[PDB]
Design a protein around this ligand. Structure first.
Ligand SMILES: [Ca+2]
Ligand SMILES: [Ca+2]
Ligand SMILES: [Cl-]
Ligand SMILES: [Cl-]
Ligand SMILES: [Cl-]
Ligand code: NA
Lengths: 224, 224
């Protein structure tokens, strides 16, 4: 039971992390630690009124990514929804869905992404998102609803992950409030990366143990 | 666009039929051809407002059975919920779920029923129910949450069904308010059967074309 999904809040330096059927709201304070739990751990169904009687409320959220304003796509197995997460209030609502992935994103039909997605993060470019499944990644535009390029190997688009535990897949991710940086998680490990839409990038600090650098998560992960 | 799910109402001679993402409430006037549409066709989304923001609202119901009082279990693929259908009123609500079938009914783990069920009808005996998947059927008690006997081929428990289209599966079923009768559906066909819990068992006037004997369904099946 490690971090299964995450997205960047519209609130500065804040991020929602999903673990099993629970979530935490974190001030992740980039470049220090110093990170601090703001809310949770609590059941998704308790913190998100609009998700209470849904599969997301029962089983939690296994992938997500922020889009714009106070909205985010959330996933569980082959299903997804777009929600308004109304940060710091009880006014969350389902905007679109819930739908199967294939009905929300027709271009994933007959692909490995059809039955579920491992992780995703929001790009700094237009309305683009990177999504990950097994050792593959996709790059999409969620507004025009299109695949920007062929699905390919994670290391083809992210050469800096060659030779690390992340080359074979990742469990969760979110974009930082710092431009062109992102966090990737897998088991007890994380990495902070600098990406640039195009190619040639780097890992800032290498693969670190998560609890060594996110002290706020000590009594939380791994969740029994 | 055929009947996918159905259950018997607590109100005398009324049944709910599910087709695609819609439903109809029928006075099905048994042993007779004076059935009549009490309500619908309507979207499940619209008739049951407790389901509007769930997978059941988006995709409809593919299996169902009444339990007792004003309750019924509903299914869509590997998911199910127990609902109060609060007949001839608003105020329908979810009681339990949505949950995976294997979480609601743990004895189905590792069986063909784990990922979905074709059809079901409530027994006259105790809190027993007959559920169908492919050419197999199960007998359960939903109150005690117990598989009552081994999973058997459908023709092992309903020999009368041998040599008919039903021997290989049912799309949909519900129990009649008439004691020990049930209706079975598949394609443009249906049968009415007299069953006897724990014994054998017969067919009432053979397989008939549905539209011939259920005129109130004229504009409704096949739905687009
Ligand atoms: Ca995940
Ligand atoms: Ca069915
Ligand atoms: Cl998944
Ligand atoms: Cl792609
Ligand atoms: Cl749902
Ligand atoms: Na998923």
């Amino acid at each position: 039971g490690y971090i299964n999904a995450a997205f960047r809040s519209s609130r500065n330096n804040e991020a929602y992390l999903f673990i099993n059927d629970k979530y935490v709201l974190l001030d992740y304070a980039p470049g220090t630690s110093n990170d601090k739990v703001l809310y949770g751990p609590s059941f998704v169904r308790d913190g998100y009124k609009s998700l209470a009687k849904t599969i997301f409320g029962t089983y939690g959220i296994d992938c997500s990514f922020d889009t714009e304003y106070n909205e985010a796509f959330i996933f569980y197995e082959n299903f997804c929804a777009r929600i308004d997460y109304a940060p710091h209030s009880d006014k969350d609502k389902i905007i679109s869905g819930p739908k199967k992935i294939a009905d929300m994103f027709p271009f994933f039909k007959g692909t490995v992404f059809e039955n579920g997605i491992d992780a995703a993060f929001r790009s700094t470019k237009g309305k683009e998102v990177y999504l990950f499944k097994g050792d593959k990644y996709a790059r999409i535009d969620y507004l025009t609803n299109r695949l920007v390029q062929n699905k390919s190997i994670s290391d083809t688009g992210f050469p800096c992950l060659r030779g690390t535990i992340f080359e074979a897949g990742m469990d969760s991710a979110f974009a930082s409030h710092k431009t062109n940086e992102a966090y990737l998680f897998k088991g007890e490990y994380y990495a902070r990366i600098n990406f640039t839409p195009g190619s040639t990038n780097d890992i800032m600090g290498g693969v670190k143990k998560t609890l060594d650098y996110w002290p706020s998560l000590r009594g939380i992960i791994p969740l029994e």
